[PDB]
Amino acid sequence: VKSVTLITKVFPEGEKVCAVVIEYPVEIDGQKLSPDQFSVKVKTGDTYSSRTITKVYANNSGGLSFSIFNNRGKYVVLELSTEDLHSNTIVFGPNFLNTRMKLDYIVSQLVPIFDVDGNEVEPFTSKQTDEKHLIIDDFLAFTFKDPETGVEIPYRLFVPKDVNPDRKYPLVVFLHGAGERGTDNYLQVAGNRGAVVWAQPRYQVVHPCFVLAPQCPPNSSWSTLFTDRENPFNPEKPLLAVIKIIRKLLDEYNIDENRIYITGLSMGGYGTWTAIMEFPELFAAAIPICGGGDVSKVERIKDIPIWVFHAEDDPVVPVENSRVLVKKLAEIGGKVRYTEYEKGFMEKHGWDPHGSWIPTYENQEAIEWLFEQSR
Amino acid sequence: VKSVTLITKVFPEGEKVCAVVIEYPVEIDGQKLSPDQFSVKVKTGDTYSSRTITKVYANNSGGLSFSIFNNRGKYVVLELSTEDLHSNTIVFGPNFLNTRMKLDYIVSQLVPIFDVDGNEVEPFTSKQTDEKHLIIDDFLAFTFKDPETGVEIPYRLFVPKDVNPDRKYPLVVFLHGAGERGTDNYLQVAGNRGAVVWAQPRYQVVHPCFVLAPQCPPNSSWSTLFTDRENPFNPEKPLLAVIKIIRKLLDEYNIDENRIYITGLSMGGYGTWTAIMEFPELFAAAIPICGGGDVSKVERIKDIPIWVFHAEDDPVVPVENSRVLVKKLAEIGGKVRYTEYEKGFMEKHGWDPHGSWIPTYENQEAIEWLFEQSR
Amino acid sequence: VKSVTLITKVFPEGEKVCAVVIEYPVEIDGQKLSPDQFSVKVKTGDTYSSRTITKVYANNSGGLSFSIFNNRGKYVVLELSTEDLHSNTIVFGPNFLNTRMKLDYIVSQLVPIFDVDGNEVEPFTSKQTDEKHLIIDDFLAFTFKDPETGVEIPYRLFVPKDVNPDRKYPLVVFLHGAGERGTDNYLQVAGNRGAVVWAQPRYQVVHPCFVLAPQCPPNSSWSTLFTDRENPFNPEKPLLAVIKIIRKLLDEYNIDENRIYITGLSMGGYGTWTAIMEFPELFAAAIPICGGGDVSKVERIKDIPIWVFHAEDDPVVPVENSRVLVKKLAEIGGKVRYTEYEKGFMEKHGWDPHGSWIPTYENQEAIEWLFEQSR
Amino acid sequence: VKSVTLITKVFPEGEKVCAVVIEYPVEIDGQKLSPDQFSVKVKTGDTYSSRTITKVYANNSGGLSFSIFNNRGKYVVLELSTEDLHSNTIVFGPNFLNTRMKLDYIVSQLVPIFDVDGNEVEPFTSKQTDEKHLIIDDFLAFTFKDPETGVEIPYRLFVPKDVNPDRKYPLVVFLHGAGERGTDNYLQVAGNRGAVVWAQPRYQVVHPCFVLAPQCPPNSSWSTLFTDNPFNPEKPLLAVIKIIRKLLDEYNIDENRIYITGLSMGGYGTWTAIMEFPELFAAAIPICGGGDVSKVERIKDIPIWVFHAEDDPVVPVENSRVLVKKLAEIGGKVRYTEYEKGFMEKHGWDPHGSWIPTYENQEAIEWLFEQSR
Amino acid sequence: VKSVTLITKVFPEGEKVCAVVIEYPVEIDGQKLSPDQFSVKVKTGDTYSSRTITKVYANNSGGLSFSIFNNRGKYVVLELSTEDLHSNTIVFGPNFLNTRMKLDYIVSQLVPIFDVDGNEVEPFTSKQTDEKHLIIDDFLAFTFKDPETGVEIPYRLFVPKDVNPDRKYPLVVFLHGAGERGTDNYLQVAGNRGAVVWAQPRYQVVHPCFVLAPQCPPNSSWSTLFTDNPFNPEKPLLAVIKIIRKLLDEYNIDENRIYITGLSMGGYGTWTAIMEFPELFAAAIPICGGGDVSKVERIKDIPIWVFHAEDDPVVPVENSRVLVKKLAEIGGKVRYTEYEKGFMEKHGWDPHGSWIPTYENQEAIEWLFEQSR
């Protein structure tokens, strides 16, 4: 048996282990396979618990790709329920700092299975061999040293593919929330669908597009939110660092300066507002999700298309925070939109009301809308 | 213990008691509070039944506002399930006349609770002290005497706030259904989300805007629906009265004559159609929900933007009623839209199929759409 | 007792028997009727199973029309749950060929019922007397002999009504999937909501419109999908036949040549792509649902408005199939849209992931969108 | 169709319709029969409501008797569920007087069924052509006027079948049950398993015997219970003694095994019967009643097994305690089975209904019969 | 309000709060009373938690006694559910030593209630003014120091009421239960129905008798079980014999029906008691214990009924087998009821807890009492 590969995918609520792919020395028909032949367990933290297997099938790809036409291949897929308790890869530390658990699995083929050549492959158990992160392992990693400050910002960058280099494509920059702050250069891309959505085939196929995901570094913030109990709206070192890495990106890549979009939640949201306000010239449009908020400075962004999102009953970042801005924006001639989710609506869907970014990145309108903005 | 305040909010299906706020002489941390410490009961009609408490928390506001940051305050909030049987404030009388039950509650703190100062507040029970109606207690009340007829129409009016008086804002006039007919000048604003939606922060913050809610007076109707088994489409005294109170409103207030929107359901819907047809000049746009219907007269409204709404299986006001109008409108060059909800769709969501206004006022498109109309 | 009429309606997932209407010699008040007075059973195949009755009511129409105002009439309606196991009329044969079961019912009035005249109608049992197919029995049937080939294509055609003959209306042509291939000239109209949606009152009332539903004939396909394991994209005899029957339609009917829309799923989808590519001049706009796919030939359709739909996890027609086209379209200047449903999304709603046409025809945007296209 | 016959059967809780037996003009292959092919509803009292069909079959018999070896033919039994809400024939009106609603049933055959050669059989609907009461229609009915007190007492009498007439058999006398006071000469025997348990084959093959169920008229009691102190003979009980004498005169009954048993008011009834005629009876099972403890000496020699649920809310458990205590301390021949609080509610029975598990206690039955003089 | 009184009752599983009795200053019409009108919570140990009110009413009594005929007045009983998680007064600490948390309850009347003339009665909240322990507060408490071994033994003693003093009555001696070792003179009698079953009216009206529940101090056992071989008398058991003698000296007790019974360690206790003083006892029910099989000859003549669950994970079922086997082969007078694997888990009891169904087995009770010398 060649390998056992854990597969992760980023779901609205974060990255989860979503399937396990086993590479058999020979092919195998899944025409005959079945979930109860197999066992998948996660360690947390000193015991194992069962992940529940929803489907089973085989292919030669190695992906989650399945055809009712050729249910055979050296790769057997074990698709797992995303509703499982320990499906997440990120445990929520307290304060505002999550951590992503070194992944720990054990898999078993419990009974013999019929192979195509054939006819009998003997039961095995194995810890994993491989992680393979969907729509995360496509972002290159780079660190950046702000030559003027010292501050080092890790960042992940998605770069379109099969795409004529003689055109220029947009850039969606993503600022993450306090929870993904860190140093591992991974959290920012796995915390929620903030960076990754823009990189999904479904969208790339109609709007290619770079994505940038800077990670901002445990003890600080994008804005001066966590660095100044005086006023949280000012540009902090990390945010400035990032503007420079946008500039680096412009320099190196067929990036259309006219369509630099920015978005982020919480700290990343506060951060979006600050970015556009301290650099009105830089960005084509913004989606700030549950942040704030320098009202004196809305005059600058009067001409930037902006869709705001906040849940009414968010108890971490008060909704008044977004209302103040939108209200002032609108009366001033804005160019602004605002979906504010109803009290309960979030809970109703199984979401902390603070996680207002979740329906947001699942909004086809918002994404389509963002791409029709330009300068 | 200073006070016990019932809080009502208008939900799609009507006003419900949604929380109870207790004012304690000292502050209290909810960091330590919990639903099972407390009891909330409603009288109906000679016995009490339990309202079920979903959350518990404390603040200094007095509102449903909660921060995971300062779960303390002289106000303790007891949030109640909106799914409870006797959560409504309006019992449906038979015929077509609802009544709103004088509200009758009793609340108890069942065990001692730790205060911040501290440390021990002793169990109590109390009937209520206060009602405090969210997004209803913002509409001023006024009665109007139609000097030409005699007819007295009570009305509630919402008036934007924090808003430059040197600009002019729109006016959304709301005509309610037979069920809210009356004299108490409350029903029209609590029957459903018809008046109140337009006054929600989420919308006011991007389109300020007056709202008018005339109440029409038990034995009559907006159109001659209930006053003439000959043809129901003609302007009845109440509807005419109202046009005059629009005129009063224009006179007194920075109301933009170009953006007078009108909407209503059933009798209020029939009434919307009549209003625009007998005063094509007055209104910028209309949303008529399950009404009718003077087809001869569609030529006048040929230029008014109109979105129609009716559920297919409404058994009170037949759907053909809306189809006839829309059909004739469209072929004539309308300027019309039409969402007709599928048989079952309503039931499926827990709604009488006659209550087609419910998804409607919960439609972001419809609201956004209404505000981009003007003359 | 005059008659017992089975009523069918086409639901997203196919035609189902949805109610039973009994014609009584006298009138009857349903004011007093009730489901438990009655029994409805289906044969499958040598035993009967219970259909579950959700409502009961009476009218004089004979339709599913109900008024809380006149719950009386010679027609008693027995509305049945659409969630029943043997509610469908089509059993899925294996391979790619469904068949529609000759319908077999037995109904009983189990106890006496009070009539209006009155007062006592005696229990009965009866097999059915009548089928009466909603929004299917409106399409005329015609067969066509392609004079150049020999191929005979049956087809169903919907023709607007109450509509000025001096204007011209659009034509929505529907190509069905392999499953509805056949000869009975019915399957194509009952397999899913593909033809019928466009004929629903809700839409006809705002966009009248012909609908054409050719049926393509067991051993073949619209494109050369099933007729050439070399390349599936070429025009097959049936598809060509159909273009000619469009021409027949133009000739005979007030059909606006500028607004000939085309749509279809699977084989019908493959077929849509081919149609527009081999006749760029003929069609105003297209919605191809899970098909393919001649990439070399996208240059021709560069100017046709097109909304593509495919579910990510469709295992019959791979999603890459639609992505390839959309991707190439877009970079070439398309005029294209693309909703690709998320892995799981379908299953989540109770739908085979291959049935991506189901949310699609239930999309108000897509329908509204289609009608604003023209030449 | 030749007929549709209801079948009643006395369950611990009382009488119930528990089968509908449908008589065909041919022979039906029950092999292929199914509950979902029929429907049975009971009118109450304005509307009808469904009865749950639990099983189906197919004998030549006509009784609720089924054999896996021939599931055929002429007769078709539909067994109904006894957890159905409207399975009770008796409805407790608002008092101590229940009543037996005349039975109203409609029965339909929903689909064609295959007969034995098969051959379809085409659907029908019908009201019932028949009632038929198991074991309960096996008790002869008689009335007796007290010659004496005018006061007429209806009785039901079970006679052993078909056993050697030149021998004497025991007599079991049952006393209901304020609930069953009346005139129909039916309530006393349908209220519960009071009189019927003795009559079931399972007990009759081994202790063949007569059983006597008189009926107290309304507005009276067996003891002076519902007149007032409550323990002296009332007209009705007096009259019953005479009926016993009448039966001895008329029947081969063993005078040394006349047993008495009763149930609530019948239970008072029982204690009074024995304390006032201590010579007459060989043994007694008073269930949740009471009686004169100043007269316990009189009965010190009769085997007695006393039954009462501790959480009884109608007849204070205390009434048995006092008697049992005094009895045992004075020499005895007494038994006591005091059901624990909760036990009754645990088994779905009103805690006053202690006769329910009692008459179902095979040890108590066998015990009674081991008595004599 | 005059008072709020908790009511404890010994359930097979141990002691529980099962009613709160609320004393008004007027008379309440229980007819109109409802569970949803009150709330009762038990503090444990930091927070409180809800108790389930299952029933409500309304007597002048004060006990858990209800009559449908007057649901009134002064006193109001709220019965609590015994399937509640925190219904146990005793919490098993981590060992063979449980403990009885001082009872902490808060009780509220949520709505006005109609009194008998009615007349509202206005809501209140209160902690408890009272405990009150059913049957358990009917055993006098005494201590005894061994004059002898210093070793002090607390005991509870039940005395028959109110029966003829010029007669001798049996004595039942109960031995807990490592769990119930202590000093409070309460655990032995609350752990389970060990001592109380004998005291319930249902058994007392028919076999009136004394019962003795001594308490083994902690760190000891009745036999040498928790010292070490485990079958010889320990200080505690020795002392208890003397208490028996003391009671005979002090009380009208029939020396020919002194019965011994115990339960786990008390069960060892029992086998040791009899093998070391074979003259003293008339019969014995050892429950899941063991003992010296080399000394079985000694006891060959005492009626004994042995009980033990086969899947016991504390005291190997084998210990009873060996004794019962040797006993029967040697002449006997022995019974054995070995509960099948699963039976205990089927009924919600720890398979070690075999005393639970045993003390609930009315056949075993009646059996013990049929013994003598």
XYZ file of N, CA, C and O in Angstrom, chain D residues 96 226 305 310-316 320-322 324-326 328-329 334-341 345 363, chain E residues 9 12 55 57 64-69 79 161-164 167 193 200-207 360 362 366:
224
model
N -69.521 7.929 39.718
C -69.334 6.483 39.693
C -70.433 5.798 38.891
O -71.104 4.891 39.385
N -72.486 3.582 50.006
C -73.089 4.754 49.365
C -74.490 5.060 49.903
O -75.333 5.615 49.200
N -57.121 -13.324 50.970
C -55.966 -12.624 50.393
C -56.366 -11.198 49.964
O -57.132 -10.988 49.020
N -50.892 1.233 47.350
C -50.611 2.117 48.491
C -50.959 3.585 48.235
O -51.414 4.318 49.135
N -50.750 3.994 46.992
C -51.082 5.332 46.545
C -52.489 5.352 45.908
O -52.706 5.967 44.855
N -53.450 4.674 46.532
C -54.821 4.756 46.040
C -55.463 6.084 46.440
O -55.492 6.438 47.602
N -55.979 6.830 45.465
C -56.593 8.110 45.776
C -58.103 8.069 45.920
O -58.693 9.125 46.098
N -58.719 6.894 45.788
C -60.180 6.734 45.998
C -60.555 6.062 47.351
O -61.393 6.543 48.083
N -59.931 4.928 47.641
C -60.188 4.162 48.836
C -58.817 4.067 49.512
O -57.974 3.303 49.062
N -58.577 4.891 50.548
C -57.379 4.947 51.365
C -56.795 3.593 51.674
O -57.448 2.789 52.314
N -57.277 -1.323 54.270
C -56.833 -2.712 54.235
C -55.838 -2.969 55.349
O -55.902 -3.969 56.034
N -54.923 -2.041 55.539
C -53.948 -2.160 56.594
C -54.586 -2.515 57.914
O -54.219 -3.509 58.557
N -55.561 -1.698 58.301
C -56.214 -1.850 59.591
C -56.798 -3.267 59.762
O -56.650 -3.878 60.830
N -56.084 -6.061 57.943
C -55.057 -7.091 57.816
C -54.280 -7.179 59.117
O -53.969 -8.278 59.579
N -53.985 -6.010 59.701
C -53.223 -5.932 60.946
C -53.998 -6.612 62.050
O -53.520 -7.559 62.650
N -55.216 -6.154 62.280
C -56.044 -6.733 63.324
C -56.225 -8.238 63.116
O -56.181 -9.003 64.064
N -54.305 -10.578 61.469
C -53.116 -11.381 61.678
C -52.784 -11.469 63.161
O -52.364 -12.526 63.634
N -52.994 -10.369 63.891
C -52.682 -10.342 65.319
C -53.652 -11.192 66.098
O -53.350 -11.631 67.178
N -54.607 -14.868 56.711
C -54.718 -13.652 55.918
C -53.469 -13.393 55.082
O -52.344 -13.552 55.565
N -53.678 -12.979 53.834
C -52.599 -12.489 52.985
C -52.789 -11.079 52.489
O -53.895 -10.586 52.394
N -51.690 -10.435 52.147
C -51.741 -9.033 51.780
C -50.706 -8.707 50.723
O -49.509 -9.001 50.878
N -51.159 -8.093 49.636
C -50.265 -7.696 48.555
C -50.408 -6.212 48.235
O -51.139 -5.834 47.319
N -49.708 -5.376 48.994
C -49.878 -3.935 48.892
C -48.928 -3.330 47.872
O -47.748 -3.121 48.145
N -49.455 -3.056 46.688
C -48.665 -2.519 45.582
C -47.993 -1.169 45.922
O -48.660 -0.231 46.390
N -46.677 -1.084 45.698
C -45.869 0.138 45.978
C -46.241 1.367 45.137
O -46.572 1.241 43.955
N -46.134 2.553 45.745
C -46.432 3.843 45.076
C -45.588 3.993 43.808
O -44.382 3.794 43.851
N -48.887 3.537 38.222
C -48.538 4.500 37.188
C -47.405 3.959 36.277
O -47.457 4.164 35.068
N -50.860 -16.647 40.776
C -50.619 -17.218 42.078
C -51.871 -17.027 42.899
O -52.318 -17.959 43.554
N -37.310 9.489 51.230
C -37.918 8.157 51.201
C -36.829 7.251 50.674
O -36.105 7.652 49.761
N -35.154 1.675 46.390
C -34.199 0.569 46.248
C -32.763 1.064 46.074
O -31.813 0.431 46.565
N -46.415 15.800 40.144
C -47.808 15.795 40.605
C -48.010 16.855 41.723
O -47.034 17.237 42.380
N -50.956 18.530 44.843
C -52.192 18.410 45.608
C -52.005 18.903 47.039
O -51.102 19.689 47.322
N -47.543 12.363 51.930
C -47.729 12.250 50.486
C -49.065 11.609 50.100
O -49.136 10.853 49.140
N -50.125 11.912 50.843
C -51.392 11.202 50.666
C -52.474 12.092 50.094
O -52.797 13.171 50.614
N -53.060 11.595 49.022
C -53.922 12.391 48.190
C -55.238 11.632 48.070
O -55.253 10.396 47.970
N -56.342 12.363 48.130
C -57.643 11.768 47.829
C -58.389 12.567 46.760
O -58.523 13.771 46.895
N -58.885 11.914 45.714
C -59.636 12.635 44.692
C -60.864 13.344 45.252
O -61.456 14.186 44.586
N -61.249 13.014 46.474
C -62.495 13.558 47.028
C -62.415 14.882 47.765
O -63.366 15.663 47.733
N -44.737 16.442 44.473
C -43.937 15.235 44.249
C -42.920 15.480 43.173
O -43.246 16.018 42.091
N -44.861 -0.763 66.237
C -45.937 -0.021 66.849
C -47.215 -0.730 66.470
O -47.217 -1.645 65.645
N -48.328 -0.268 67.030
C -48.510 -0.221 68.475
C -49.198 -1.488 68.969
O -50.398 -1.491 69.244
N -48.424 -2.560 69.078
C -48.953 -3.890 69.059
C -48.800 -4.459 70.461
O -48.083 -3.892 71.305
N -49.514 -5.555 70.706
C -49.623 -6.165 72.029
C -48.256 -6.476 72.716
O -47.507 -7.380 72.299
N -46.322 -10.014 74.070
C -46.020 -11.032 73.114
C -44.635 -10.712 72.625
O -44.183 -9.556 72.711
N -32.618 -0.243 50.568
C -33.759 -0.691 51.356
C -33.419 -1.812 52.343
O -34.272 -2.595 52.715
N -41.810 -1.278 56.477
C -42.946 -0.701 55.751
C -44.270 -1.295 56.227
O -44.383 -2.528 56.411
N -45.280 -0.427 56.445
C -46.613 -0.917 56.831
C -47.036 -2.243 56.126
O -47.533 -3.178 56.759
N -46.780 -2.328 54.829
C -47.198 -3.474 54.066
C -46.680 -4.770 54.644
O -47.282 -5.810 54.396
N -45.568 -4.725 55.387
C -45.000 -5.953 55.937
C -45.247 -5.996 57.407
O -45.253 -7.065 58.002
N -45.457 -4.824 57.987
C -45.585 -4.699 59.429
C -46.976 -5.090 59.937
O -47.112 -5.580 61.072
N -48.001 -4.874 59.107
C -49.362 -5.304 59.446
C -49.480 -6.828 59.532
O -50.379 -7.335 60.190
N -48.565 -7.545 58.879
C -48.638 -9.005 58.737
C -47.477 -9.743 59.446
O -47.627 -10.881 59.839
N -46.333 -9.097 59.621
C -45.206 -9.685 60.340
C -44.627 -8.574 61.167
O -43.509 -8.109 60.869
N -36.674 -6.410 47.200
C -37.934 -6.086 46.552
C -38.673 -7.359 46.206
O -39.727 -7.308 45.573
N -40.938 -9.904 47.385
C -41.967 -10.310 48.375
C -41.975 -11.810 48.759
O -42.432 -12.177 49.858
N -41.588 -13.049 52.819
C -42.538 -13.987 53.422
C -41.854 -15.258 53.826
O -42.264 -15.891 54.814
